[PDB]
Amino acid sequence: DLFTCEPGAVDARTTSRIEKATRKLLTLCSNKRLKLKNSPPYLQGILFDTNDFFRRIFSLNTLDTLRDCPYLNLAVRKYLIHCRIATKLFRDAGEEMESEDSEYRRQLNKYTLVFSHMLADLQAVYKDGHLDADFTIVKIDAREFWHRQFGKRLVVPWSELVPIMQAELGLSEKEGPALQHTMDITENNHVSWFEFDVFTRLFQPWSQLINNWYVLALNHPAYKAFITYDEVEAILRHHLHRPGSYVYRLSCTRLGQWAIGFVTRAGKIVQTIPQNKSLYQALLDGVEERLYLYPDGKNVQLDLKRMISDAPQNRVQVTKEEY
């Protein structure tokens, strides 16, 4: 496969290769013809920042120190490959790339989301440009799990993680691909400690981790995945006459945290990032405080506890073709 942790990608020419791939792509997405907006995820800024952050790592560490790092070799390979794919996407239908609604541009907006994740992942694993050898996964149960299964390893292949999550967390095989879509956000067939940290912060509490994921990310009408602040507002404007309408979303600038948009009792649209509170609990309290009543403006009342109680049986009835 293409994405591997073995040494060979980190050497004295790595930053040259990273810079050549980066400007090759910065020249492409520099058409003022392209209506590319600054709104995050901002592809040009990410590309600039990522090239800059690799240069920082190679200026702060000798090759002897970087050469054999499983994470850094993976991240270099993924970046160079992702630049290659994105560059080829620009080539194919150069004019159509101007078509804001084209399949080409929707693939591009998807590719810049991945770029954004890759940078946030690199900046966590190599915090301040040095290997954070004593990384701290935030949620205590996820931290103990990673330590007990993997010790101080930075990153593990998806295929090694899957049997452990089956045995310890009750994942079934058929759910694997859907799970990888949510957890392997850098899309490199591995899960770094930071991706695992992001996922376990999102779908806490640990004791219901997979069921929370199945309900909150696969079966809740309010979930809008990675959309922008403006997109949330555009949704909710349809529902100003319906106080308690709400959606929630993931934020590419705040991995591992949710944002919730709702219509207040006065008709205002409000977007918050719940402080120090899980999405599960934020939804429970918002129903109890009568803030979050109509998921996506729809006239259905969700008993979230009941949905999580019911999720083991419901997960059984979903077949392999439905995923």
CB-closest chain residue to Ca ion: 186
In angstroms, give the least distance from the CB of 24 to Ca ion. Answer: 24
Is 19 part of any known ligand binding site? no
Q: Which residues bind Ca ion (CB under 5 A)?
A: 184, 186, 188, 190
Is 211 part of any known ligand binding site? no
CB contact set of 235 (below 8 Å; sequence gap of 6+):
224, 247, 261, 296, 297
Residue 198 or 283: the one with the smaller Cβ distance to Ca ion is: 198
In angstroms, give the least distance from the CB of 158 to Ca ion. Answer: 8
C-alpha span between 41 and 226 (Å, rounded): 10
Q: Taking each helix axis as running N to C, give the angle between helix 176-183 and helix 158-169, from 0 to 180 degrees, rounded to the nearest 10.
A: 110
Residue 94 or 163: the one with the smaller Cβ distance to Ca ion is: 163
Residue 125 or 215: the one with the smaller Cβ distance to Ca ion is: 125
Compute, in degrees rounded to 10, the torsion defined by CA atoms 183, 186, 191, 196: -50
Residue 93 or 164: the one with the smaller Cβ distance to Ca ion is: 164
The DSSP-derived string for 250-261 is E-TTSTT-EEEE
In angstroms, give the least distance from the CB of 189 to Ca ion. Answer: 7
Residue 181 or 290: the one with the smaller Cβ distance to Ca ion is: 181
In angstroms, give the least distance from the CB of 184 to Ca ion. Answer: 4
C-alpha span between 159 and 161 (Å, rounded): 6
In angstroms, give the least distance from the CB of 190 to Ca ion. Answer: 5
Is 52 part of any known ligand binding site? no
Nearest alpha carbon to residue 50 among 13, 87, 78: 78
Question: 19 burial class (0-12, 13-18, 19+ CB within 10 angstroms)?
Answer: middle
Please enumerate, by residue number, every residue annotated as part of a binding site for Ca(2+). Answer: 184, 186, 188, 190, 195
Please enumerate, by residue number, every residue annotated as part of a binding site. Answer: 184, 186, 188, 190, 195
